[PDB]
Amino acid sequence: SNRQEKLAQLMRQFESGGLYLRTVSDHRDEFENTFMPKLDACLGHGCDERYWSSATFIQQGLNGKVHDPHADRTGLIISADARLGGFSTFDYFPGQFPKFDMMGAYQATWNEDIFSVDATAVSEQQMDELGIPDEYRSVFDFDRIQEKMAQPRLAGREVEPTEAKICYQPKDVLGIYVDVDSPASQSKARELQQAMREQGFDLPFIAYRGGAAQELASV
Amino acid sequence: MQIFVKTLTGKTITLEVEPSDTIENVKAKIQDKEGIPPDQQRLIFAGKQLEDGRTLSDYNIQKESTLHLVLRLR
């Protein structure tokens, strides 16, 4: 798809069921050591699920923050069709994702039996007998992400960065994240967008903030 | 190597340790800084409670990992 087609697909997903936003500390590391190996596989014997990455769920009307401690990252806007490994509101091989937040759950219930189980390998039955509240559980499909985030979205309440483990493929990359308050973010995004276009993936710049997304000309 | 320990009041403790250290030795080291006997300690990592008798390597606990200290009775 061309740039306009990606932009349209991005906004369509953002305005309906949402999608993912992955900030990156090192755009060259992400391009050279994650995107390019994914692409080589896709154009070779086929795409594979070698590389898993952290990203935040974004969606129109959901005032969600992204992970950027120094307000200086660029990043990738990634399709909701990316393969999902696990999602939580609190914050790699599939199977490593915790079913629930042990320390969070303990500080909610003060049920010391929480410490008798392994939170990466506990049955939904066990978790019910333990009394683990739903806000401390992870979810593992996209519809459950939407449901988990529906109450803050409809409330218009600000929330912290959420974490999905995803495995994106090159076709899933729909946009380049730009922090409009950061010179560094815009400098890095510029370079990253140029490198991806040169590979055949021409992406729009996207200002995301506070449940709203906007296309940018150049940064 | 250096690992960290967080309390349920938010305190961060630092610990010099080696991967062959048993969980017993890690707790002895917390005892020296916090005065908590090891039998009153739970150490949590990656959603699991660590077992005395096993080591840091048995849990693949690597440098700069953060543990979570919870007090218990015995």
UniProtKB/Swiss-Prot annotation, chain A:
It is an enzyme of class 2 (transferase). It catalyses: L-threonyl-[protein] + NAD(+) = O-(ADP-D-ribosyl)-L-threonyl-[protein] + nicotinamide + H(+). Changing residue 163 to A: Abolishes the ability to modify ubiquitin in HEK293T cells. GO terms for molecular function: glycosyltransferase activity. Its EC number is 2.4.2.-. One of its GO terms (cellular component) is host cell. Disruption phenotype: Deletion of the gene abolishes the modifications and effects on mono-ubiquitin and polyubiquitin chains. It reduces bacterial survival in mouse livers 5-fold at 3 days postinfection and dramatically reduces bacterial survival 100-fold at 6 days postinfection. Keywords: Glycosyltransferase, Secreted, Transferase, Virulence. It is found in: Secreted; Host cell. The keyword Hydrolase does not apply. Changing residue 22 to A: Abolishes the ability to modify ubiquitin in HEK293T cells. The keyword Phosphoprotein does not apply. Interacts directly with host ubiquitin. ADP-ribosyltransferase that specifically modifies host ubiquitin on 'Thr-66' residue, which causes the shutdown of polyubiquitin synthesis and disrupts the recognition and reversal of polyubiquitin in host cells during infection. Threonine ADP-ribosylation of ubiquitin prevents the transfer of ubiquitin from ubiquitin-activating enzyme E1 to ubiquitin-conjugating enzyme E2, which inhibits subsequent ubiquitin activation and leads to the shutdown of polyubiquitin synthesis in host cells. This is NAD(+)--protein-threonine ADP-ribosyltransferase. It comes from Chromobacterium violaceum (strain ATCC 12472 / DSM 30191 / JCM 1249 / CCUG 213 / NBRC 12614 / NCIMB 9131 / NCTC 9757 / MK).
